[PDB]
Design a protein around this ligand. Structure first.
Ligand code: HEA
Ligand code: HEA
Ligand code: PEK
Ligand code: PGV
Ligand code: CQX
Ligand code: CQX
Ligand code: CQX
Ligand code: CUA
Ligand code: PER
Ligand code: CU
Ligand code: MG
Ligand code: NA
Ligand code: NA
Ligand code: ZN
Lengths: 49, 91, 75, 44, 136, 55, 514, 70, 40, 72, 254, 102, 227
């Protein structure tokens, strides 16, 4: 007799994973969060004095 | 001079019941641990009760830290599920 | 004289008493020397040590209190 | 006194929606309180 | 609640009571038959005797489930939902960050950090090549 | 003085269903009411003082 | 009948229930505060205002989570519910005084709320050090209200400690020795000893602070010959034992949960678990000055406190290894409560070990008053004490309510919380090692990535808290009544059914002496 | 006919072997930290200072304009 | 542990309502204040 | 017994109290008013007292307790 | 029930006591900050009412209703001991404060103890009388205890009266000593440690004298038996605690 | 020793008037140990089941033998082989033969 | 100073902080040893269908479960206490500097010879010059001679503060009425930043410390010029 997880398990798993990834990547990259990553290998120093 | 009442004179309610039962070597309020019998089917531990069941704890071996607990019912003697010693309710 | 040397009476992180004692000794030393027509400039060693160690506001407050008659240290 | 499931508590579970309303007022008032004190203070 | 009860537990293979307490007509007949040789019992009768005593078999009580999928998927849904709160926060609660995060300020600040040789042994300036005037 | 403990034992063991705090009689109910009224009224006053002091 | 039952209670179960409700409400307040801290820190800059409002929030967070969530849930809630049942006692020794320990907490909480509503609040840290907490730098009522809040919570716990020690020593079956009581009962007794000895010293110190603030005493004021460091000694004389009070009942519940879901009749090494809790309780009184390694103490004093503090790892390790040895050979049931307990064993170990790092006075110079300390204590509190609370609550909810939870929902709750707490606190180690101070509303720009991530974790934790409210509602909404509970032969608290009747053990258990 | 396998003490036997393995793995993992991090750090400090010239380091900083005092 | 079937089953729909109401009880009051900080 | 402790009460305890009482009453009187010096570690006032005019200690005795500014 | 423990009737006193605590503390706050004593007075009043009724009820439950079986009595013994222990640790904090200040006097004090400008009480004057007074009260209360155990009403009452008179005498002597002292609580840490430590101890004398007075009236009313009198034993243990604290104060803080 | 432990357990199950409580207590105790019981113990337990007219408990006893073996898949087939004469003689079917392994 | 995405300590500037970096690596290796042992054993306990649920003999492990952790504590405590005592060994400094904590700024006094003192405030964010560090820069830096043992004495004129400079291994509480000592020795010139490390009110986050380490000649020159 199949249970809740036999019926909906793979669907909950695939949708949840897809939603979680999509929304976190969007939050991380699309709304102007400044993460302030290392400058190392990324920033060209520029004269300051 | 005297003038101070004694327990005999003035103890009342449950304190008085306990005192009077102790003089007769009786323990209706369970102050004392009951002494075990040999616990065989022929000689089971007699468990007084005011109802038709009472919880038993069996310390199977002295200085076991684990006590084994079960409901003892009115009727045929039951056995500790750990050591098999016999207990019989006397309501 | 460069700075206050290590003093084995005061070997710990808490240096409170080192400042205090040297401030006291400067004034005690001056009193005892001036009383005996002695050389008062000897006491300069104590003044240098307390000036190195003591916060300016502590020296200033103690000086004010001595002027006021309310300094609680014995000199 | 009332004995058994749903009867040994100071709140009623007779109706799940009235329970929802009471649980939400209960927990939501505790969660909300600091925010409302922040508001209170900034407005001074 | 005070009565002996049934459990399926692999370290308690013979529980305190049978699974089926109250037996029909034929179930009592089957029990009477169990008193005679068991070779005379059919496969069906044997299974039935088993299911009067026991609820689940070992294989059944020990079965795997797909619950992990629902748990992991639902957790990831809720974690996803959390990122919606963060987006909401970013748009409606947070104002501008300080000007020191502007790209030019960072370029300047980075040079000055290399000029003062911030963390020159390992952590920062160590990763800059002073001879070639580039990151290693 | 005379030992009147027996009288107080009869009184406090009367099978009238009252909890111990009220079993002395009418005087108990009054002292209870005064106590609880001061406590509750004073708690209200204390919340009033908080409202006033919060501004 | 409602006022008689819930305001005038003399019943250990109902009082336990009140404590659990109070503590769950407090936990929401403390979660809101945690979110406000992490919202301020979630991007560089100023969100709420300067460090005064920020540290009002931080200080309240700490008091609420410690005195109004953890202690009432573990000792008031689980202690009242379980202790009498676990020794077959008919109630607590002092069932009426027990009710006052409960009713002192809403007023204590009202005082703390009042402290934050008046003037500019008490932005002192939970430690309340002078002279910042004195009447010149914190003029006005806020600090006084905070002191009074602590006095009431202190009295509540002192009276509760007397009640638990008396109950546990005096009200066992006459055949039962102290070494035939369950480990949770031991953990409660030992916690009660710690409360009895430590809270009066706190009371003295905070009373001195009150008199310095209002009666012109100078206990902590150099101008009168007083010393701010004296306040620190008195506070931490209490404050170290206080963290053992926070964890010990959780140790007790973990032993029960691990045993039960391993299919075992008993924890491994019962005597060693008792010895270990007593050792920890003793050692917890002789280590307080590891909170003071940067105040300017003598070198030999620093060596002694470094050494004595590390010794605590030995008995604590005995308990961790014994939990693993309880799992050993188990029929493992992967219930939600089991998950909380396994997460406890590992994450509490990690937090304990960063405590051992901090025990080293020389290294503590650089770690003290940074986020490394914050990471240590949140592993042992948010992933230790709280994991034990959640484990215990899921495990015993059916006993207390008579209803089952939805186990799948409870596992989802665990998974989300696990992600949230680790994301919040793991990066705080890096923030500490690299120099980010405690009690800051803003940070130099370098610290932005880890602060950002940490704040994101706090929002995941929020989601778990909200979900827990839903899960409890769904259980009461669906009304799945308990049928059978296994292993009652070694878990006495279950044997009177779910929930047990108002009065249990009217007729005491029969246990012979043989 | 099937030969008689070992029937007693299987859990204990698994633990006797796997405990040795636990210690080896845990020692290996800790020693890898020591190698990858601690030994690397010792070498990086000894190498940095071996021929370090504090005055040259100072002059470069001075020239770049970093100091109030020079 | 085993249990009797739910006396008053809570359908998926009913859980979606309970969950939404729960989350909104936390999120709306806090969100209101957080949105309006500037105004204060 | 009671007899012993009664003996101790009348033979040792109360006579000791009587002698100390006699000696305190005889050697009471009123001694020197200490000369006032406005030392900064004494007569501390960080907040006014919550009674009187704010500047008088609870058991203030005009004969021997100066105010911050001296005797009354 | 077939155990010997006491299931207490539902009671309002815990709630009134907890609210009395709220009113005393919020009342102290209103006194210190807003210059008003009303709240505080209401709290003191409700606290006194709660104490009166709560302990009235314990007497009802024991003398009049018979609920204090040996097992209940044994629990009260533990509870009073543990309560005393908590009070000892409260006092320990003030001893710690005293030694901290006195063994490392700071520069503001003149770096000496006693501080410059402080004229300490002479411990061989009124404080020696105080000491004789509390020691004598420890002897008298012991006589009272033995008289009670021997069944002697008159001598119990006489001994207990003497004990109370001595505690009142101590309190009057200490009030006078407070008035006569040339230093005050505001005379830096010397005044702070002296008055707060002796002041809390004087509070405890008052409390213990009050407890003895309750015992006196209960003995007048024949509540105590020659073998059952735990209220009296508890008051005597508390009184001995009061005595021992004084002796430590006398030796240490003077 | 192993042999002495085995002989006590064989002797236990062999008691002619063993009752149902005792059979259950025997088996439930035995499966708490770190061992799969020897065929001669199981043989004696199976024959108690026969004296007690309890076919279902006989099947259950074979399941618990397999279960105690864990990942050691050679132990069950082996015990079955050793038990076949007793299985044939008493008409005890295996869980596999009853479909109770699915 | 700290840099973005940093995981560990700021690079050592003093021999003492170098020692602390090594000791931390040594202790963290042990942290990893124990935490990996526990996770491995957890995982081992949970991954077998084999069972043993009857009573287990606990006395067999008594020794190794207490002795091996005792030995590991010794392996921590020995280097820990060596460093404790080394750091306490007799300091003969060439220079004494005082710092006083204030709400919310630091003052410095160099009074071995002349009465030099000044205040040191945070540069407001609106006033930072291009490339300067938000919340870290000060107006007047603490100029000090490199490659010399320096005695720093720390106190406060109001509430508690704490004077910290992570890269030199320094953190000394600033307690009014008390004069706390630490010693400072930089192996290098440069700029070394710290921040107030005891909660002190409104602007606790906003009262940093900047040490400027230079050759003695430039320290003397600056000294004379700040009089
Ligand atoms: C028990 C104690 C406890 C707990 C659980 C927490 C939990 C959290 N704390 Fe902590 N915190 C402290 C005690 C605690 N905290 C203390 C003592 C300080 C130092 C104060 C000072 O510096 O003076 C501090 C400081 C502190 C800081 C540093 C502030 C600073 O230095 O500037 C931060 C920063 O992120 C932080 C964050 C959080 C977060 C995000 C959580 C989250 O993990 C919280 C999430 C929610 C929960 C873990 C569950 C809540 C519980 C319930 C809802 C009850 C449920 C009820 C039943 C089951 C019956 N806290
Ligand atoms: C539940 C709460 C809790 C617990 C249980 C502990 C437990 C420990 N704590 Fe912690 N701690 C706090 C909460 C707690 N802490 C809080 C709240 C603060 C900050 C107060 C403030 O400033 O606000 C703090 C601060 C703190 C400090 C001060 C640091 C500073 O301010 O600079 C120190 C210093 O020694 C410390 C150490 C320890 C140690 C050694 C233990 C030990 O008990 C840990 C022992 C456990 C283990 C070691 C793990 C298990 C062991 C094994 C698996 C065996 C093998 C191990 C070894 C051989 C090492 N803690
Ligand atoms: C009473 C006992 C202790 C209370 C505190 C201080 C009183 C100390 C004893 C005393 O009465 O000291 C007097 C001052 O009283 C004063 O300030 C009187 C101040 C009266 C108001 C006291 C405020 C209440 C204190 C709160 C108590 C906290 C209780 C905590 C319990 C802990 C629970 C865990 C001394 O008189 P003086 O004129 O300064 O000097 C003598 C000069 N001839
Ligand atoms: C102050 C007054 C205390 C009055 C207590 C009266 C009640 C009492 O003493 O109650 C007794 C029980 O003791 C009990 O509860 C003992 C409980 C009383 C402890 C009171 C101690 C003082 C509390 C003061 C608060 C301290 C505040 C200090 C601030 C730091 C009643 O038992 P018995 O005396 O055996 O009588 C029964 C016999 O008659 C039978 O034959
Ligand atoms: C039970 C606990 C409840 C806790 C509630 C905590 C919420 C705290 C808000 C505290 O408000 C503090 C006042 O802060 C305001 O005034 C301060 C002083 O003028 C300023 O320094 C701040 O920038 C802020 O604007
Ligand atoms: C927790 C409950 C604690 C209760 C604290 C009670 C304290 C009551 C103090 C009452 O003091 C009133 C003020 O009395 C002081 O000032 C008055 C002049 O204003 C004088 O007449 C008094 O002699 C005294 O010096
Ligand atoms: C055992 C410890 C001692 C505690 C004893 C407390 C009981 C005594 C209370 C008496 O209180 C009053 C002090 O009052 C004296 O000085 C006050 C200030 O100058 C005056 O207002 C009063 O009129 C009185 O002259
Ligand atoms: Cu100054 Cu924090
Ligand atoms: O306190 O750790
Ligand atoms: Cu500690
Ligand atoms: Mg600090
Ligand atoms: Na911020
Ligand atoms: Na007696
Ligand atoms: Zn048994």
């Amino acid at each position: 007799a199949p249970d809740f997880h036999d019926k909906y398990g793979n669907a909950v798993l695939a949708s949840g994973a897809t939603f979680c990834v999509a929304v976190w990547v969007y939050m991380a990259t699309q709304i102007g969060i400044e993460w302030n990553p290392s400058p190392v290998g990324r920033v060209t120093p520029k004269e300051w004095r | 001079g005297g003038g101070v009442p004694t327990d005999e004179e003035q103890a009342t309610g449950l304190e008085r019941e306990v005192m009077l039962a102790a003089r007769k070597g009786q323990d209706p309020y369970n102050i004392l641990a009951p002494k075990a019998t040999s616990g065989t089917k022929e000689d089971p531990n007699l468990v007084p009760s005011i109802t038709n069941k009472r919880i038993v704890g069996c310390i199977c071996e002295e200085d076991n830290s684990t006590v084994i607990w079960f409901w003892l019912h009115k009727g045929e003697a039951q056995r500790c599920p750990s050591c098999g010693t016999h207990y019989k309710l006397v309501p | 004289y460069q700075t206050a040397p290590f003093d084995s009476r005061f070997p710990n992180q808490n240096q409170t008493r080192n400042c205090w004692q040297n401030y006291l000794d400067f004034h005690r030393c001056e009193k005892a020397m001036t009383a005996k027509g002695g050389d008062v400039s000897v006491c300069e060693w104590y003044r240098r040590v307390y000036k190195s160690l003591c916060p300016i506001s502590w020296v200033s407050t103690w000086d004010d209190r001595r002027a006021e008659g309310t300094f609680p240290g014995k000199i | 006194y009332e004995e058994g499931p749903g009867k040994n508590i100071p709140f009623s579970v007779e109706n799940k929606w009235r329970l929802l309303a009471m649980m939400t007022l209960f927990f939501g008032s505790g969660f909300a309180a600091p925010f409302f004190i922040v508001r209170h203070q900034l407005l001074k | 609640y005070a009565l002996p009860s049934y459990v399926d537990r692999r370290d308690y293979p013979l529980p305190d009571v049978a699974h089926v307490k109250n037996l029909s007509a034929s179930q009592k007949a089957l029990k009477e038959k169990e008193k005679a040789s068991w070779s005379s019992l059919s496969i069906d009768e044997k299974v039935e005797l088993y299911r009067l005593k026991f609820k689940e078999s070992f294989a059944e009580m020990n079965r795997s489930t797909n619950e992990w999928k629902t748990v992991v998927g639902a957790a990831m849904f809720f974690i996803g939902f959390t990122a919606l709160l963060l987006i909401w926060e970013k748009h409606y609660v947070y104002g501008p960050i300080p000007h020191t995060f502007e790209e030019e300020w960072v370029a300047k600040q980075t040079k000055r950090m290399l000029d003062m040789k911030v963390a020159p042994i390992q952590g920062f300036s160590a990763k800059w090549d002073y001879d070639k005037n580039e990151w290693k | 003085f005379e030992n009147r403990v027996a009288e107080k034992q009869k009184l406090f063991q009367e099978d009238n269903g009252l909890p111990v705090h009220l079993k002395g009689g009418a005087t108990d109910n009054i002292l209870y009411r005064v106590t609880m009224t001061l406590c509750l009224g004073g708690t209200l006053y204390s919340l009033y003082c908080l409202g006033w002091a919060s501004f | 009948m409602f006022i008689n039952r819930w305001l005038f209670s003399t019943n250990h179960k109902d009082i336990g229930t009140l404590y659990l409700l109070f503590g769950a409400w407090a936990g929401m307040v403390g979660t809101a505060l945690s979110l406000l801290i992490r919202a301020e820190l979630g991007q560089p800059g100023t969100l709420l205002g300067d460090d005064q409002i920020y540290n009002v929030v931080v200080t309240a967070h700490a008091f609420v989570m410690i005195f109004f969530m953890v202690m009432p849930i573990m000792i008031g809630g689980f202690g009242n519910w379980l202790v009498p049942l676990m020794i077959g006692a008919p109630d607590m020794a002092f069932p009426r005084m027990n009710n006052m320990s409960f009713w002192l907490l809403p007023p204590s909480f009202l005082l703390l709320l009042a402290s934050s509503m008046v003037e500019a609040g008490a932005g002192t840290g939970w430690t309340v050090y002078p002279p910042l907490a004195g009447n010149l730098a914190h003029a006005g009522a806020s600090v006084d209200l905070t002191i009074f809040s602590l006095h009431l919570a202190g009295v509540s716990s002192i009276l509760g400690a007397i009640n638990f020690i008396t109950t546990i020593i005096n009200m066992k079956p006459p055949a039962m020795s102290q070494y035939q009581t369950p480990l949770f009962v031991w953990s409660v007794m030992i916690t009660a000893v710690l409360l009895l000895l430590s809270l009066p010293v706190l009371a003295a110190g905070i009373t001195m602070l009150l008199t310095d603030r209002n009666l012109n005493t100078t206990f902590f004021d150099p101008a009168g010959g007083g010393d701010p460091i004296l306040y620190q000694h008195l506070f931490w004389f209490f404050g170290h034992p206080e963290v053992y009070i926070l964890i010990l009942p959780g140790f007790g519940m973990i032993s029960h949960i691990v045993t039960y879901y391993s299919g075992k009749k008993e924890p491994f090494g019962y005597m060693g678990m008792v010895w270990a809790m007593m050792s920890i309780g003793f050692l917890g009184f002789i280590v307080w000055a590891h909170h003071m390694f940067t105040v300017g103490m003598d070198v030999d004093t620093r060596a002694y406190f470094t050494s004595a503090t590390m010794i605590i790892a030995i008995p604590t390790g005995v308990k961790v290894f014994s939990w693993l040895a309880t799992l050993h050979g188990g029929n493992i049931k992967w219930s939600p409560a089991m998950m909380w307990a396994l997460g406890f064993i590992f994450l509490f170990t990690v937090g304990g070990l960063t405590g051992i790092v901090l025990a080293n006075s020389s290294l503590d110079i650089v770690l003290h008053d940074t986020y490394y300390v914050v990471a240590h204590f949140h592993y042992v509190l948010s992933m230790g004490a709280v994991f034990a609370i959640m484990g215990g609550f899921v495990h015993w909810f059916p006993l207390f309510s008579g209803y089952t939870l939805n186990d799948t929902w409870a596992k989802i709750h665990f998974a989300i919380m696990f992600v949230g707490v680790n994301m919040t606190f793991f990066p705080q180690h890096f923030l500490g090692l690299s120099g980010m101070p405690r009690r800051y509303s803003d940070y130099p720009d370098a610290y932005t990535m880890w602060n950002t991530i940490s704040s994101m974790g706090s929002f995941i934790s929020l989601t778990a808290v909200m979900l827990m409210v839903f899960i409890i509602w769904e259980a009461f909404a669906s009304k799945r009544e308990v049928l059978t509970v296994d292993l009652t032969t070694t878990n006495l608290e279950w044997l009177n059914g779910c929930p047990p009747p108002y009065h249990t053990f009217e007729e005491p258990t029969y246990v012979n002496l043989k | 006919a099937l030969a008689k396998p070992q029937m007693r003490g299987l859990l204990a036997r698994r633990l006797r072997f796997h405990i040795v393995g636990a210690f080896m793995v845990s020692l290996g993992f800790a020693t890898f930290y020591k190698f990858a991090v601690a030994e690397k750090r010792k070498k990086a400090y000894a190498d940095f200072y071996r021929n370090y010239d504090s005055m040259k380091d100072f002059e470069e900083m001075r020239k770049a304009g970093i100091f109030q005092s020079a | 542990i085993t249990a009797k079937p739910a006396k008053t089953p809570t359908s998926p729909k009913e859980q979606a309502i309970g969950l939404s109401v729960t989350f909104l009880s936390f999120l709306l009051p806090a969100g209101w204040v957080l949105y309006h900080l500037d105004n204060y | 017994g009671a007899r012993t402790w009664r003996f101790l009460t009348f033979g040792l305890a109360l006579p000791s109290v009587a002698l100390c009482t006699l000696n305190s009453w005889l050697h009471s009187g009123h001694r020197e008013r200490p000369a006032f010096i406005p030392y900064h570690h004494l007569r501390i006032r960080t907040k006014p007292f919550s009674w009187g005019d704010g500047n008088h200690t609870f058991f203030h005795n005009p004969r021997v307790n100066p105010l911050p500014t001296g005797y009354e | 029930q077939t155990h010997a423990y006491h299931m207490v009737n539902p009671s309002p006193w815990p709630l009134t006591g907890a609210l009395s605590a709220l009113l005393m503390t919020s009342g102290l706050t209103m006194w210190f900050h807003f210059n008003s004593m009303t709240l505080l007075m209401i709290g003191l009043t409700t606290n006194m009412l709660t104490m009166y009724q709560w302990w009235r009820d314990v007497i009802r439950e024991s003398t009049f209703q018979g609920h204090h079986t040996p097992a209940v009595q044994k629990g009260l013994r533990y509870g009073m001991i543990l309560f005393i222990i908590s009070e000892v640790l409260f006092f320990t904090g003030f001893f710690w404060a005293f030694y901290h200040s006195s063994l490392a006097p700071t520069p503001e004090l003149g770096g000496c103890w006693p501080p410059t400008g402080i004229h300490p009480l002479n411990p061989l004057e009124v404080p020696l009388l105080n000491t004789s007074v509390l020691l004598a009260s420890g002897v008298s209360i012991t006589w009272a205890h033995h008289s009670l155990m021997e069944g002697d009403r008159k001598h119990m009452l006489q001994a207990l009266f003497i004990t109370i008179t001595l505690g009142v005498y101590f309190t009057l002597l200490q009030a006078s000593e407070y008035y006569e002292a040339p230093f005050t609580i505001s005379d830096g840490v010397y005044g702070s440690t002296f008055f707060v430590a002796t002041g809390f101890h004087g509070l405890h004398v008052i409390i213990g004298s009050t407890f003895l007075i309750v015992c006196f009236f209960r003995q007048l009313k024949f509540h105590f038996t020659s073998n059952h009198h735990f209220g009296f034993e508890a008051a005597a243990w508390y009184w001995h605690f009061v005595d021992v604290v004084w002796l430590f104060l006398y030796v240490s803080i003077y | 020793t192993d042999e002495e432990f085995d002989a006590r357990w064989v002797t236990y199950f062999n008691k002619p008037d063993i009752d149902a409580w005792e059979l259950r207590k025997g088996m439930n105790t035995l499966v708490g140990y770190d061992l799969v019981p020897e065929p001669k113990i199981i043989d004696a337990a199976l024959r108690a089941c026969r004296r007690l007219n309890d076919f279902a408990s006989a099947v259950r006893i074979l399941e618990v033998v397999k279960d105690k073996a864990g990942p050691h898949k050679e132990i069950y087939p082996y015990v079955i082989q050793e038990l076949r004469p007793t299985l044939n003689e008493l008409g005890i079917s295996t869980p596999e033969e009853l479909g109770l392994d699915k | 100073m700290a840099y973005p995405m940093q995981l560990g300590f700021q690079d050592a500037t003093s021999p003492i902080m170098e020692e602390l970096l090594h000791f931390h690596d040594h202790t963290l290796m042990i942290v990893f040893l124990i935490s990996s042992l526990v996770l491995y054993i957890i995982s081992l306990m949970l991954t077998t269908k084999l069972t043993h649920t009857s009573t287990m003999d606990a006395q067999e492990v008594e020794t190794i479960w207490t002795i091996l952790p005792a030995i590991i504590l010794i392996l921590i405590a020995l280097p820990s206490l060596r460093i404790l005592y080394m750091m306490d060994e007799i300091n003969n400094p060439s220079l004494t500097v005082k710092t006083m904590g204030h709400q919310w700024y630091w003052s410095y006094e160099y009074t071995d010879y002349e009465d030099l003192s000044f205040d040191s405030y945070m540069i407001p964010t609106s006033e930072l010059k291009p490339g300067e560090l938000r919340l870290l820069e000060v107006d007047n830096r603490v100029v000090l001679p490199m490659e010399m043992t320096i005695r720093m004495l720390v106190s406060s004129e109001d509430v508690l503060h704490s004077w910290a400079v992570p890269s030199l291994g320094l953190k000394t509480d600033a307690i009014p009425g008390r004069l706390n000592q630490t010693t400072l020795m930089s192996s290098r010139p440069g700029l070394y930043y710290g921040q107030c490390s005891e909660i002190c009110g409104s602007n606790h986050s906003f009262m940093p410390i900047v040490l400027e380490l230079v050759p003695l000649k430039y320290f003397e020159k600056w000294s004379a010029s700040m009089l």
